[PDB]
Amino acid sequence: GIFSIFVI
Amino acid sequence: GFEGGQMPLYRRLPKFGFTSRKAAITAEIRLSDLAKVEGGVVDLNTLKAANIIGIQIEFAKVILAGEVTTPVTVRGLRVTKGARAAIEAAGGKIEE
Amino acid sequence: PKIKTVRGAAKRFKKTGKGGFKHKHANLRHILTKKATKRKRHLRPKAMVSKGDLGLVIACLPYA
Amino acid sequence: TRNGRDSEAKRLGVKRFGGESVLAGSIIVRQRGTKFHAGANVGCGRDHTLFAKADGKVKFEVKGPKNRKFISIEAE
Amino acid sequence: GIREKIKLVSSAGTGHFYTTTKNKRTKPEKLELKKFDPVVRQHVIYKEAKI
RNA sequence: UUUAAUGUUUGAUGUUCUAACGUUGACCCGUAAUCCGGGUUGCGGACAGUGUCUGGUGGGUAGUUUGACUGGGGCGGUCUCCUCCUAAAGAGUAACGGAGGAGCACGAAGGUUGGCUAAUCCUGGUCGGACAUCAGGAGGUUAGUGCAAUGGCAUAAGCCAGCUUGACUGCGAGCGUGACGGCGCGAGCAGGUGCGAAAGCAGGUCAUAGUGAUCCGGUGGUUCUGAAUGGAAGGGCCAUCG
RNA sequence: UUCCUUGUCGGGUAAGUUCCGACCUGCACGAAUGGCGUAAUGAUGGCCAGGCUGUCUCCACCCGAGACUCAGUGAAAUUGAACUCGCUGUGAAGAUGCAGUGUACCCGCGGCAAGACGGAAAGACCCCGUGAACCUUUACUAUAGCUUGACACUGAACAUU
RNA sequence: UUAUUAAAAACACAGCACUGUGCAAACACGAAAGUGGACGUAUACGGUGUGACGCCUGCCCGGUGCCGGAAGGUUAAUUG
RNA sequence: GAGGACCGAACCGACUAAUGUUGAAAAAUUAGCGGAUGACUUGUGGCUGGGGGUGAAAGGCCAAUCAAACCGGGAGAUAG
RNA sequence: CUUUUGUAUAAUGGGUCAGCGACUUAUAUUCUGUAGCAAGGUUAACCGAAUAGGGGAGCCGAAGGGAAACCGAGUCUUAA
Ligand SMILES: CC[C@H]1OC(=O)[C@H](C)[C@@H](O[C@@H]2C[C@@](C)(OC)[C@@H](O)[C@H](C)O2)[C@H](C)[C@@H](O[C@@H]2O[C@H](C)C[C@H](N(C)C)[C@H]2O)[C@@](C)(O)C[C@@H](C)C(=O)[C@H](C)[C@@H](O)[C@@]1(C)O
Ligand SMILES: [Mg+2]
Ligand SMILES: [Mg+2]
Ligand SMILES: [Mg+2]
Ligand SMILES: [Mg+2]
Ligand SMILES: [Mg+2]
Ligand SMILES: [Mg+2]
Ligand SMILES: [Mg+2]
Ligand SMILES: [Mg+2]
Ligand SMILES: [Mg+2]
Ligand SMILES: [Mg+2]
Ligand SMILES: [Mg+2]
Ligand SMILES: [Mg+2]
Ligand SMILES: [Mg+2]
Ligand SMILES: [Mg+2]
Ligand SMILES: [Mg+2]
Ligand SMILES: [Mg+2]
Ligand SMILES: [Mg+2]
Ligand SMILES: [Mg+2]
Ligand SMILES: [Mg+2]
Ligand SMILES: [Mg+2]
Ligand SMILES: [Mg+2]
Ligand SMILES: [Mg+2]
Ligand SMILES: [Mg+2]
Ligand SMILES: [Mg+2]
Ligand SMILES: [Mg+2]
Ligand SMILES: [Mg+2]
Ligand SMILES: [Mg+2]
Ligand SMILES: [Mg+2]
Ligand SMILES: [Mg+2]
Ligand SMILES: [Mg+2]
Ligand SMILES: [Mg+2]
Ligand SMILES: [Mg+2]
Ligand SMILES: [Mg+2]
Ligand SMILES: [Mg+2]
Ligand SMILES: [Mg+2]
Ligand SMILES: [Mg+2]
Ligand SMILES: [Mg+2]
Ligand SMILES: [Mg+2]
Ligand SMILES: [Mg+2]
Ligand SMILES: [Mg+2]
Ligand SMILES: [Mg+2]
Ligand SMILES: [Mg+2]
Ligand SMILES: [Mg+2]
Ligand SMILES: [Mg+2]
Ligand SMILES: [Mg+2]
Ligand SMILES: [Mg+2]
Ligand SMILES: [Mg+2]
Ligand SMILES: [Mg+2]
Ligand SMILES: [Mg+2]
Ligand SMILES: [Mg+2]
Ligand SMILES: [Mg+2]
Ligand SMILES: [Mg+2]
Ligand SMILES: [Mg+2]
Ligand SMILES: [Mg+2]
Ligand SMILES: [Mg+2]
Ligand SMILES: [Mg+2]
Ligand SMILES: [Mg+2]
Ligand SMILES: [Mg+2]
Ligand SMILES: [Mg+2]
Ligand SMILES: [Mg+2]
Ligand SMILES: [Mg+2]
């Protein structure tokens, strides 16, 4: 999973 | 010796002294050892042959510890002041 | 194997007749000029190791 | 932001109270000035510490024309 | 800061010395005191030298 | 001190030379071969190049470091020591709680003997005035203390002068304060001193800040050790410096 | 590229924080890590109009493949155990399970997703570790390479100082 | 061009410029022998930057780099 | 009868939307889309190797693995 | 169950059953218990028809003080 796409 | 990162006790404190090489080749004899030789004469080689001192020992001293009952001649050893009196009180004699 | 002596502790402690250890006092190496003479005089003889630190010395000296 | 400093506590005060039996050389009071003064058999150190010079009991008293507090030692 | 260490050498034969500090600038003359020499056990004049 | 001189050691730069060495110039042979080797010639030539030592440059490459506290972390502050409050009338007692200082000075600003007494104000008085020096009176420490704050100080610890080096060496009953390392107070002894007629007082300074363990070394001294023996080097011990 | 800012004025619209033209107060453009123009090109960014339409007002009906039922074969993620309602309060601070109280006959089938802080992957953000990797530099220390001289392979003669 | 979330304004490009390089070339891969550059020879070859074309490209050499200079100051191995 | 010319099949690509997302498929189908005589495209063999390659440059690609491939050893690394 | 100041917690972990799965071993050192011997105690390698017997090389203990030379029931400090 490419978790860094989640906008923080 | 680890104390949490504080300088430990064997390293905050200074070193002192030196080791003498002459102290390792010197022994002390008690009055109880003078009756454990054979012959009645006590020099360095009779004390070595009775397994009283070691083989590398080159100097010895008779000190006032225990008691001696027999006449004993001492040859080539050092004697303390009280042990000279105690060897002579038992009929012995001390020569260097 | 044998236990190895902490060799730097064997250069700073000597065992006495009843099993305690003696050591040389600190604070007597340099800036001696600014110190008082009574203070430097009392630092000259050897002292004994306190009770709380004795076990740490015993850990360093298994063959003493 | 500007403060934050303090010194270490000096453990001053009275070490031996009235009626306590002390040995010669015992420290009775630590003080800054002479809040207490030296009486009979009581010395005064260089930082005004009052100590015993004999064995006996500590005695406190107010003496003199200025009503000052004195510390003495009465031999037992 | 400004105050420089010196030492006072015994004028007897001994090597014994005391150490002290001295302001070099306001007092340029050499310090000289009679102090106890512990080797000969007398009071001898002592004189200033370098540390 | 200079010059010039004969015999004489090099050191350098320059100019020639060939015989080391180069030749990715030509020709021949091995040889059916633009490798290579030998040979014959030209060009260079003690240069260039390589080895050991050495100075520079060297993120081209490599191994690593780049603190903590913190009303999240960062940015900002702070980090040891001294005094006062918080601190609840013994000691101790936290906060990025409220407020200020230190990292010295002084052979006199230390010891002793003798002596002495302050601020401020009014009043009279040459320049002199709101404030100098002088006389008197009020007053009672509201002054002073080498530098912060507190506690002290008249028997003065404040001010003045004569003489001086105790701002001594070896020790120290007994106490205080620290987890420790350590730090502090101390009468009294031994030796030798200063002041005073004498009793006495003196081991720095009114007290409390003015500081840094160990290692590694440096410098003097010593009745210690000295790897066959006599020395020496090095080590130790004492004093002291970074 | 402009923070203040939707700067101000004109155009286009019934109405324009975008667009186009212009001004100059350029927080903080600018000349080959180019300045300013530019026909032609672009599955390039923005804006306007005509055609056209189910994008929409506002959806209706139809045709097919599933979903549904009958027969055959037959998975999966998950899962402490379950006799597994609501509301107000309490409570490791957002309750199916606790307190009070109200409602509730037993068991399926087709649907929908409000909750089970649903499932999935030991949070990528953030902090910590005296953790890692790789990258930078006038951080520290080294070093390859490049460069300096000395001696060696390296000799003959003659000048000047 | 980011095989598998980015096709672009990013990359390349013809053109321009500066810089090095005289041939056993500079440079690169190789402890080295060699090889590519090149069976090329400055109208050529490597590196750097900009980016068809048009009008153009102003001032600064104080700092860092680079090119040149050698009087002087300082300075290693070596000698002693 | 020129062209990194034009429209457009094969051939090579991958811009948009729907779908699928325990897929028909560990990157695809459908309908539209770009190039299509060239810096094209493709079969067969060969060469370049891990701090190394190759890169019209995305830290891309090197067997569904890449800011340092995979396999075996050091090795039971070390883990406050 | 774990972790915490604190868990019904909507914090962690476990679908269930069976089997396997985590404080060992060597050598040194100190304290304790027990046994042998006692101002003494005990051997290593090795030899040995071999758990016997020999082997006392060594180790610890009965004496400390000092940096040390050295002195010694004392010794060091100091001129004392
Ligand atoms: C197709 C099939 C795949 O599913 C997806 O790709 C979907 C479409 C992702 O998209 C999403 C889409 C996008 C918008 O998220 C919706 C983005 O936020 C994330 C990163 O990827 C999901 C859902 C992500 O979820 C979210 O990941 C976040 C880190 C936290 C978030 N939640 C815990 C808070 C969580 O739900 C997270 C990484 O992919 C899922 C991890 C566990 C996977 O590996 C998933 C299951 C894959 O295996 C799956 C089979 O391949
Ligand atoms: Mg010393
Ligand atoms: Mg070299
Ligand atoms: Mg690096
Ligand atoms: Mg921190
Ligand atoms: Mg903050
Ligand atoms: Mg402290
Ligand atoms: Mg109190
Ligand atoms: Mg004074
Ligand atoms: Mg003071
Ligand atoms: Mg010798
Ligand atoms: Mg308008
Ligand atoms: Mg405009
Ligand atoms: Mg610009
Ligand atoms: Mg320009
Ligand atoms: Mg320019
Ligand atoms: Mg242009
Ligand atoms: Mg356009
Ligand atoms: Mg419109
Ligand atoms: Mg069905
Ligand atoms: Mg069925
Ligand atoms: Mg409810
Ligand atoms: Mg509720
Ligand atoms: Mg229940
Ligand atoms: Mg209920
Ligand atoms: Mg649904
Ligand atoms: Mg539940
Ligand atoms: Mg969830
Ligand atoms: Mg939900
Ligand atoms: Mg986690
Ligand atoms: Mg560096
Ligand atoms: Mg992609
Ligand atoms: Mg492609
Ligand atoms: Mg896309
Ligand atoms: Mg795409
Ligand atoms: Mg495109
Ligand atoms: Mg180039
Ligand atoms: Mg460009
Ligand atoms: Mg130059
Ligand atoms: Mg074409
Ligand atoms: Mg076409
Ligand atoms: Mg497509
Ligand atoms: Mg298609
Ligand atoms: Mg097409
Ligand atoms: Mg990048
Ligand atoms: Mg690469
Ligand atoms: Mg791949
Ligand atoms: Mg690596
Ligand atoms: Mg492991
Ligand atoms: Mg290992
Ligand atoms: Mg658990
Ligand atoms: Mg646990
Ligand atoms: Mg928790
Ligand atoms: Mg607990
Ligand atoms: Mg908690
Ligand atoms: Mg509970
Ligand atoms: Mg639970
Ligand atoms: Mg959770
Ligand atoms: Mg679970
Ligand atoms: Mg189970
Ligand atoms: Mg036996
Ligand atoms: Mg004694």
CA pseudo-torsion sign B77, B82, B84, B89: negative
Segments of chain D assigned E as strands: 13-14, 21-22, 27-30, 37-38, 42-44, 50-52, 56-63, 68-74
d(Cα B15, Cα C12) in Å, to the nearest integer? 5
Going by C-alpha positions, the residue among B56, B52, B91 that lies closest to residue B43 is B52
> For the domain that residue B30 is a member of, what is the CATH number?
3.100.10.10
- Whether B10 and C59 lie within 8 Å, measured CB to CB: no
Atom of ligand 1 nearest to the CA of A6: 18
Atom of ligand 1 nearest to the CA of A5: 20
Residue B5: inside a domain, yes or no?
no
How close are the terminal C-alpha atoms of chain B, in Å? 50
**Domain limits, chain E:** 1-51
Going by C-alpha positions, the residue among D38, D57, D58, D39 that lies closest to residue D48 is D38
Distances (CA, A) of C14 to B15, B72, C10, C23: 11, 37, 7, 7
Residue B7: inside a domain, yes or no?
no
- Resolution, angstroms, 1 dp: 2.9
d(Cα C59, Cα C1) in Å, to the nearest integer? 17
Residue B11: inside a domain, yes or no?
no
- Whether B13 and C11 lie within 8 Å, measured CB to CB: no
DSSP for residue B27: E
Q: What angle do CA C9, C18, B31 make, to 5 degrees?
A: 115
The token duo for B51 is 């397994």
- DSSP codes of every residue in chain C: -PPPP-TTTTTT-EE-TTS-EEE--SS-SS-GGGS-HHHHHHTSS-EE--STTHHHHHHH-S--
Residue B74: inside a domain, yes or no?
yes
> What is the span of the domain harbouring residue B67?
21-94
Neighbour-count burial for C15-44, b at 16+ CB within 10 Å, e otherwise: eeeeeebebbeeeeeeeeeeeeeeeeeeee
CB C60 within 8 A of CB C21: no
d(Cα B65, Cα B12) in Å, to the nearest integer? 40
| CB contacts, 8 Å: C57 with chain B | 9-10
In this structure, which long-range contacts are made by residues C46-54, counting pairs with CB atoms below 8 Å and at least 24 apart in sequence?
A: C46/B16, C46/C22, C47/C22, C47/C23, C48/C16, C48/C20, C48/C21, C48/C22, C48/C23, C49/B9, C49/C13, C49/C20, C49/C21, C49/C22, C49/C23, C53/B9, C54/C20, C54/C21
The token duo for D70 is 């004195």
CB D52 within 8 A of CB D23: yes
- How many CB atoms lie under 10 A from the CB of residue D38? 19
- Ligand 46 centroid – CA A2 distance (Å): 23
**Domain limits, chain C:** 1-64
Distances (CA, A) of C61 to A3, B17, C29, C50, E39: 57, 18, 25, 16, 40
Domains of chain D: residue spans and CATH: 13-74 (2.40.50.100)
d(Cα D29, Cα D16) in Å, to the nearest integer? 7
Domain count, chain B: 1
| CB contacts, 8 Å: B3 with chain C | 56
The owner of tokens 């190791």 is C49
Residue B12 half-sphere exposure, CB side, CA atoms within 13 Å?
12
- How many CB atoms lie under 10 A from the CB of residue B63? 15
Residue in chain E lying closest to C34 (CA): E20
Task: Protein contacts on strand G: list nucleotides below 7 Å from a Cβ.
Answer: 121, 123-125, 130
Residue B47: inside a domain, yes or no?
yes
Residue B1: inside a domain, yes or no?
no
Residue B85: inside a domain, yes or no?
yes
DSSP for residue B46: H
Method: cryo-EM
Q: What are phi and psi of B46, to 5 degrees?
A: -80, -35
d(Cα D22, Cα D59) in Å, to the nearest integer? 11
Q: Which residues of C touch B (CB under 8 A)?
A: 6, 8-9, 11-13, 23-24, 26, 28-29, 46, 49, 53, 56-57, 59-60
Residue B72: inside a domain, yes or no?
yes
> Which one-letter amino acid corresponds to residue E44?
V
Segments of B1-96 assigned E as strands: 26-29, 41-42, 59-62, 73-75, 78-79, 93-95
